[PDB]
Amino acid sequence: IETPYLLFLGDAPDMLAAKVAIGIRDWRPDHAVGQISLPGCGANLGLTEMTLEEAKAAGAKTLVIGVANRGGKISQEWKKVLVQALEEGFDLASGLHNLLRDEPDLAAVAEATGRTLHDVRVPSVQYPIADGVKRRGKRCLAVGTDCSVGKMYTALAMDAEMQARGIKSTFRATGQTGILITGDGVPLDAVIADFMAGSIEYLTPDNDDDHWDLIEGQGSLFHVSYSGVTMALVHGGQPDALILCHEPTRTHMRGLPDYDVPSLEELRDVALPLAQRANKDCKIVGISVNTQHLGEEEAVAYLKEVEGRMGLPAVDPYRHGAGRLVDALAA
């Protein structure tokens, strides 16, 4: 995706629909020159409100859909702006369920203007079958006890810290949100079975010996709907370092009311031998817990006993940053 962006907010009624736009603004502010809102928009993202022509003059290359749709249909009100952006010289990028290229007007305008539609939720390049060959560079993967346990935030927090420290690193997106944030990645949840692991090898190629890939995790080895997606990361990713991610108050898996959440111990016992198959030197180096549903001192107490029991640094990166996780990568 050509950077920098104009962030499309559409008619999103508030900030709830604007997770992607917020993610770009917060994590890669240099990738956004401004926002464009339709009448009735209530998402006060806080960037410079620009017309298409103003955003073009400011250097924007891609109109990025930063708000949710519904999973339904791209409205004609939206396409009216999208078409005009194409005619104004913008590429489009969208992580929605409905694909821009399945809109015959968007596809034909894109073809006539020479502009590109980036439907980042589904693959647009052919990935190979993984070869398991050892790749130069270092690779860190977060694995968790459930979906939505902070894997993406943890990888983003570690990368941001490492960048501030002058450590060579790249956040390697594996889903549409992270791809729109960084402008590149692999939409692993939409990759065909046989190419899953190969797509993660493609995502994390040979790099400098002192370079870190911070791979965005997906699924869970303990989630019967997605465990194979996680497996492809664990092996395709060849991780040198695992971060264990966990949220402690939930009593069931995501969307699976009758499935337990495993402990950090069984996550450790199951994940490490699998990871060691692809990289025999892989180590679990730290634990990143979402403690937002605990009280302040409850969180501090929980983290302390986790650290003493697992013998690994355990932090909540939102409460205090990723610095102790980044320190753990140095060994």
Swiss-Prot record:
Enzyme class: transferase
Reaction catalyzed: D-glutamate + acetyl-CoA = N-acetyl-D-glutamate + CoA + H(+)
Disulfide pattern: none
Alphabetically ordered keywords of this record: Transferase
Effect of R121A: Small decrease in activity
Pfam families documented for this protein: DUF1611, DUF1611_N
InterPro entries listed in its UniProt record: DgcN-like, DgcN-like_C, DgcN-like_N, P-loop_NTPase
Pathway, per record: Amino-acid degradation
Keyword Protease annotated: no
Gene3D superfamilies tied to this protein: NAD(P)-binding Rossmann-like Domain, P-loop containing nucleotide triphosphate hydrolases
Keyword Transmembrane among UniProt keywords: no
EC number: 2.3.1.312
Family indicated by similarity: Belongs to the N-acetyltransferase DgcN family.
NCBIfam families xref list: DgcN (NF041892)
Known function: N-acetyltransferase involved in a deamination-independent D-glutamate degradation pathway, named the DgcN-DgcA pathway. Catalyzes the transfer of the acetyl moiety from acetyl-CoA to D-glutamate to generate N-acetyl-D-glutamate.
Protein name according to UniProt: D-glutamate N-acetyltransferase
